Scaffold this active site. Structure first.
Site, PDB file in Angstrom:
ATOM      1  N   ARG A   1       0.811  -1.187   0.000  1.00 32.48           N
ATOM      2  CA  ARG A   1       0.000   0.000   0.000  1.00 32.48           C
ATOM      3  C   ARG A   1       0.859   1.258   0.000  1.00 32.48           C
ATOM      4  NH1 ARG A   1      -5.085   1.491   3.637  1.00 32.48           N
ATOM      5  NH2 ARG A   1      -5.112   3.745   3.253  1.00 32.48           N
TER       6      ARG A   1
ATOM      7  N   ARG B   1      -5.825   2.272  -3.382  1.00 28.88           N
ATOM      8  CA  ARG B   1      -4.991   1.462  -2.501  1.00 28.88           C
ATOM      9  C   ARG B   1      -5.095  -0.042  -2.836  1.00 28.88           C
ATOM     10  NH1 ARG B   1      -8.295   3.726   1.563  1.00 28.88           N
ATOM     11  NH2 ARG B   1      -7.079   5.540   0.800  1.00 28.88           N
TER      12      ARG B   1
ATOM     13  N   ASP C   1      -6.759  -2.061   2.140  1.00 31.67           N
ATOM     14  CA  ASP C   1      -7.170  -1.372   3.311  1.00 31.67           C
ATOM     15  C   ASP C   1      -7.749  -2.415   4.265  1.00 31.67           C
ATOM     16  OD1 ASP C   1      -7.723   0.921   4.970  1.00 31.67           O
ATOM     17  OD2 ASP C   1      -9.820   0.807   4.333  1.00 31.67           O
TER      18      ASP C   1
ATOM     19  N   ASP D   1      -9.436  -2.490   7.964  1.00 33.39           N
ATOM     20  CA  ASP D   1     -10.051  -1.661   9.006  1.00 33.39           C
ATOM     21  C   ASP D   1     -10.675  -2.545  10.085  1.00 33.39           C
ATOM     22  OD1 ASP D   1      -9.343   0.544   7.465  1.00 33.39           O
ATOM     23  OD2 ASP D   1     -11.355   0.985   6.768  1.00 33.39           O
TER      24      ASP D   1
END
Ligand code: APC
Ligand code: 5RX
Ligand code: MG
Ligand code: MG
Ligand code: NA
Ligand code: NA
Length: 157
Positions: A83, A92, A95, A97
Site C-alpha cells: 500500500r 490502494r 485497506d 479496518d
C-alpha cells in the site's frame, strides 16, 4: 478469545487476488484465526472524488490479541500488499479496518472502534450482515441486521 470483524478493501491492482492474499496473511499471525469471510462486493467509492471501484468484504476473526496488537497486524498486512501512502488519498492495494472488537468501545488517537463511519457505509454493512447479522454494534446498541440498508452501489462481485 475475542470475536472481531475486519473490513477489507482494494481498488487498484488485482483486487480479488490482493484481498485473498490479505486474508491468508491475517490468518497466519499468532493470535488471529479467520473464522468467516463474507462474499466479495464491488462498490462505488464514497467520500472522495471519482475513483476506481472497490472490492470490499468483511472477515470474522477469533483473536487473543489486544485491540492495538490487532491494529499492528492489520497495518503490517497492508505493508505486505505494498500500500502506497502519498500526500493525497488515492487508490490502494489493500485497506484493513477494524470494524468491531467484541462489544468494546475504544477511542484512542491511533484507533477508533467501532470504526467511526461503519454505520453509514453500505460497503461495510452489507457484507458485514452476511457474517454478523446478530452481532451488536455497541454505540447504537443495534444488531448489524438492523443497521444494514439496501444500496444499489454495492453489488455481489
Ligand atoms: N478502526 C480502525 N481500523 C484501522 N485503522 C484505524 C482505525 N481507527 C483508526 N485507525 C487509524 O487510521 C490510520 C489511517 O488509516 P487509513 O487506512 O489510511 C484510513 P482509511 O481506512 O483509508 O479511511 P476510513 O477510516 O474512512 O475507512 C491508521 O494508521 C490507524 O492508526
Ligand atoms: N466503496 C468504498 N468507498 C470507500 N471510501 C473509503 S475512504 C475515502 C476514499 C479514499 C480513497 C479513495 Cl481512492 C476513495 C475513497 N474507503 C472505501 C472503501 O473501502 N470502499
Ligand atoms: Mg478504510
Ligand atoms: Mg484503513
Ligand atoms: Na493464526
Ligand atoms: Na479520538
Amino acid at each position: 478469545m475475542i470475536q472481531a470483524y475486519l473490513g477489507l478493501g482494494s481498488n487498484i491492482g488485482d483486487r480479488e487476488s490482493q484481498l485473498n492474499d490479505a486474508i491468508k496473511i491475517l490468518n497466519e499471525y499468532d493470535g488471529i484465526s479467520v473464522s468467516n469471510i463474507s462474499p466479495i462486493y464491488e462498490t462505488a467509492p464514497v467520500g472522495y472524488t471519482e475513483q476506481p471501484n472497490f472490492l470490499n468484504l468483511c472477515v470474522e476473526i477469533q483473536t487473543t490479541l489486544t485491540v492495538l496488537q490487532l491494529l499492528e497486524c492489520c497495518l503490517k498486512t497492508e505493508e505486505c500488499l505494498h500500500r502506497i501512502r502519498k500526500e493525497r488519498w488515492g487508490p490502494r492495494t489493500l485497506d484493513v479496518d477494524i470494524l468491531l472488537y467484541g462489544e468494546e468501545m475504544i477511542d484512542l488517537p491511533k484507533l477508533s472502534v467501532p470504526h467511526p463511519r461503519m454505520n453509514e457505509r453500505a460497503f461495510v454493512l452489507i457484507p458485514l450482515n452476511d457474517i454478523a447479522a446478530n452481532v451488536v454494534e455497541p454505540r447504537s446498541k443495534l444488531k448489524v441486521k438492523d443497521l444494514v440498508f439496501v444500496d444499489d452501489s454495492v453489488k455481489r462481485y
